């Protein structure tokens, strides 16, 4: 009596579960298109395992609602994006960035467009997009910046941009700061990234008149089977019904006095 | 763009005391706010923390119950309220705009400086203001190198310094050192001003030291003739 | 609630010397740090944010490192305007502290100083005290040594003396030993020297003067 299974192997299985690692990469920064996580397109998961020793290498951004958004695409556990053409006439596309690089040159996050003026003119956009898939679509996009208003004028011939996304359920509006503020990665601009869920039969309605980071698409969302992990236990060869962030557990035993974060079928401490 | 603050000088210890430190070129009513202290010759010390809005107040141990940080949004305006002043409260109170966001969507936010005052001297002491004595440092014989002279001004018996000293009004300027104030025996301050000038031009160039002391409203302007 | 410590206190090094200074503290921080450097006399300056990324008028050299405890401050080629007090702070949730400073030195050449002395002014006479003032100017290692002589009596308790903070350029010091005394015991002599000691002097220099 008194077995509890209160011992690891120390590693994490590949199998049953398919097992990504996420390695110097999070969930969100694959999910942007960081340039290190060009690798991680398209890819699904049963299981994600983000690494501490995971960091970002692109432009500085911040994901207000980070909680929701990091759960919520782990748990479709796929990384499947459809290009979508918006109409963007009247502006400047595949905006880039010197502290985000592709392949030695300059670039930006790879499902995302940095929109900037046309012969300086960024008219008053306008952009509808239907969704008729029989599934909920989920849309990123941000909001840059600027450190001084020379850069909002010299980036958007705009300066008091706004930005309003819009559906027929939710209706989200952002207004840019400009501020003298430090640098990151060598940049002193910033981004905030925000999402937006469009279910079918709705129409997403977008209405920007400045510092739009634009969508380029969509991702397949539901709320699956699959989840994420924090944990730094490397991934083996072996086969283990549970997994936790301390490694892979028999589950013979009825009860697991081991971590009270598990995947899979587990002893339920 | 920088800020600028005024209210300090020397106090009897359990005195009062308040500061304050008025803010331009920003949105004041979005970014939190402190206060900073070094004391003569030693490290830097946070003081305060005070939010946006005015609404959480965060301060060090050793001014709990005596400091109040306070600010006023619709000016641009901050405000330590500093009461049982205490001896080693004696420092440079620096005025700096320390915000905070989150960096990568992070549970707690990174922060750091935004930018820094000048700060003014808050001394505690049971004494009394009194005016330098501004003195001559004549460039005499012997008292010149071969090829280049040397003169300066003593700014001698003066009490809390913040003591400015310049040369010709700001035209001799390189080549000047302002040596640090000196507290001698009689609780009383005392520094000098050098520059060095060629040895040549002695009996046709001006030079007049600018000696001015806040504290005690004396300005001073004398001729150092060789 | 969290206490840094800052390693070295002070430190010395020369032109082109790679320095590095520690800054530990109690809790797991991760990237909450951020590094600061006081020009002497001035108000700080933002130096590095979030313990690696550098800011704005901050030179290539240096660079910063770290994560959880553990972080280094570390210039790659020292240069003359580096000598500053430098800070590291703390984004805890109050920024309690932040570390005791770390004053670096170029400290190199070995330059030897020039001395002149300055009789009481004609005004200060009048007001019954006497001051003379002995300079020592531009000179390095900071270790130099002034001595006053009445009458070639040694002198003790009655002089004060001053140190400029380093030279942004050719990176010497400067001292200013003033010897005050009553303008009755003053004029009971004629003979004051200001003897000075110093590594780049092969021998003490004295600067006297009569009356
Ligand atoms: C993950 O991020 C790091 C940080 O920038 C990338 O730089 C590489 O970091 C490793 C860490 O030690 C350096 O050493 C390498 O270690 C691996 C593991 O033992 C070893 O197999 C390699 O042969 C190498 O010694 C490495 O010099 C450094 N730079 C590189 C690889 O260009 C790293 O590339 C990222 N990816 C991985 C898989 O670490
Ligand atoms: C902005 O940057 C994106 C980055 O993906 C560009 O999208 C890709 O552009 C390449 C161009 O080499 C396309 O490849 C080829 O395009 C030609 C049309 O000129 C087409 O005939 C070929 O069959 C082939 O597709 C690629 O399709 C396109 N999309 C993807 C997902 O790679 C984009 O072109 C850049 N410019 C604009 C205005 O968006
Ligand atoms: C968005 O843009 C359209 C097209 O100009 C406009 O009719 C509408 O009022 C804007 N705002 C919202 C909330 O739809």
């Known amino acids: 009596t008194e077995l509890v299974q209160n011992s690891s192997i120390g590693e994490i299985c590949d199998s049953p579960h398919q097992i990504l690692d996420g390695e110097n990469c999070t969930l969100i920064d694959a999910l942007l298109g960081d340039p290190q996580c060009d690798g991680f397109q398209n890819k699904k998961w049963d299981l994600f395992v983000e690494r501490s020793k995971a960091y970002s290498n692109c432009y500085p951004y911040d994901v207000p609602d980070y909680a929701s958004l990091r759960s919520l695409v782990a748990s479709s556990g796929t990384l499947e994006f459809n290009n979508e053409s918006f109409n963007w006439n009247g502006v400047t596309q595949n905006g880039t960035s010197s502290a985000c690089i592709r392949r030695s040159n300059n670039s930006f996050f790879s499902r995302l467009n940095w929109l900037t003026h046309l012969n300086f003119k960024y008219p008053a956009l306008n952009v509808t997009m239907p969704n008729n898939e029989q599934f909920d679509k989920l849309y990123i996009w941000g909001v840059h910046h600027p450190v001084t208003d020379k850069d909002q004028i010299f980036l958007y011939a705009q300066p008091s941009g706004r930005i309003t996304v819009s559906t027929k359920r939710s209706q989200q509006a952002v207004i840019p700061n400009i501020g003298f503020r430090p640098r990151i990665r060598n940049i002193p601009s910033r981004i905030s990234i925000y999402w937006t869920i469009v279910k079918p039969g709705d129409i997403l309605l977008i209405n920007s008149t400045g510092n739009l980071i634009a969508p380029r698409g969509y991702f397949k969302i539901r709320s699956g089977k699959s989840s994420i992990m924090r944990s730094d236990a490397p991934i083996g060869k072996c086969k283990s019904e549970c997994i936790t962030p301390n490694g892979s557990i028999p589950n013979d035993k009825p009860f697991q006095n081991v971590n009270r974060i598990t995947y899979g079928a587990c002893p339920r401490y | ?226 | 609630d969290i206490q840094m410590t800052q390693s070295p206190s002070s430190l010395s090094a020369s032109v082109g010397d790679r320095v590095t200074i520690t800054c530990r503290a109690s809790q797991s921080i991760s990237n909450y740090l951020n590094w600061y450097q006081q020009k002497p006399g001035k108000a700080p300056k933002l130096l590095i944010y979030v313990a690696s990324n550098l800011q704005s008028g901050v030179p290539s050299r240096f660079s910063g490192s770290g994560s959880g405890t553990d972080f280094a401050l570390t210039i790659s080629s020292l240069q003359p305007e580096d000598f500053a007090s430098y800070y590291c702070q703390q984004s805890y949730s109050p920024v309690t502290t932040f570390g005791g400073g770390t004053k670096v030195e170029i400290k190199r050449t070995v330059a030897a100083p020039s001395v002149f002395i300055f009789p009481p002014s004609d005004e200060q006479l009048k007001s019954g005290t006497a001051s003379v003032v002995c300079l020592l100017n531009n000179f390095y290692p900071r270790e130099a040594k002034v001595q006053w002589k009445v009458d070639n009596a040694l002198q003790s308790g009655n002089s004060q003396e001053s140190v400029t903070e380093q030279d942004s350029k050719d990176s010497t010091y400067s001292l200013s030993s003033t010897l005050t005394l009553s303008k009755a015991d003053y004029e009971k002599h004629k003979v004051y020297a200001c003897e000075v000691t110093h590594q780049g002097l092969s021998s003490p220099v004295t600067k006297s003067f009569n009356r």
Not at chain 2, 15 to 40: D, E, H, I, K
Not at chain 2, 115 to 138: E, H, N
């Open chain 2, 1 to 226: 763009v920088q800020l600028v603050q005024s209210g300090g000088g020397l106090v009897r210890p359990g005195g009062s005391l308040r500061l304050s430190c008025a803010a331009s070129g920003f949105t004041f009513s979005s970014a939190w706010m402190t206060w900073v202290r070094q004391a003569p010759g030693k490290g830097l010390e946070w003081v305060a923390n005070i939010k946006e809005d005015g609404s959480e107040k965060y301060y060090v141990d050793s001014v709990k119950g005596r400091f109040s940080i306070s600010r006023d949004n619709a000016k641009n305006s901050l405000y330590l309220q500093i009461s049982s002043l205490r001896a080693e409260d004696t420092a440079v109170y620096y005025c700096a705009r320390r915000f905070v966001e989150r960096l990568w969507g992070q549970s707690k936010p990174y922060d750091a400086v935004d930018i820094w005052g000048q700060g003014t001297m808050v001394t505690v002491s049971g004494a009394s203001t009194k005016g330098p004595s501004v003195f001559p440092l004549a460039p005499s014989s012997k008292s010149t190198s071969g090829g280049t002279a040397a003169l300066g001004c003593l700014v001698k018996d003066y009490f809390p310094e913040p003591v400015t000293v310049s040369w010709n009004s700001g035209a001799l300027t390189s080549g000047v050192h302002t040596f640090p104030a000196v507290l001698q025996s009689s609780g009383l301050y005392s520094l000098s001003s050098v520059v060095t000038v060629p040895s040549s031009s002695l009996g046709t160039q001006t030079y007049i030291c600018n000696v001015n002391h806040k504290p005690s409203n004396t300005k001073v302007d004398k001729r150092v003739e060789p």
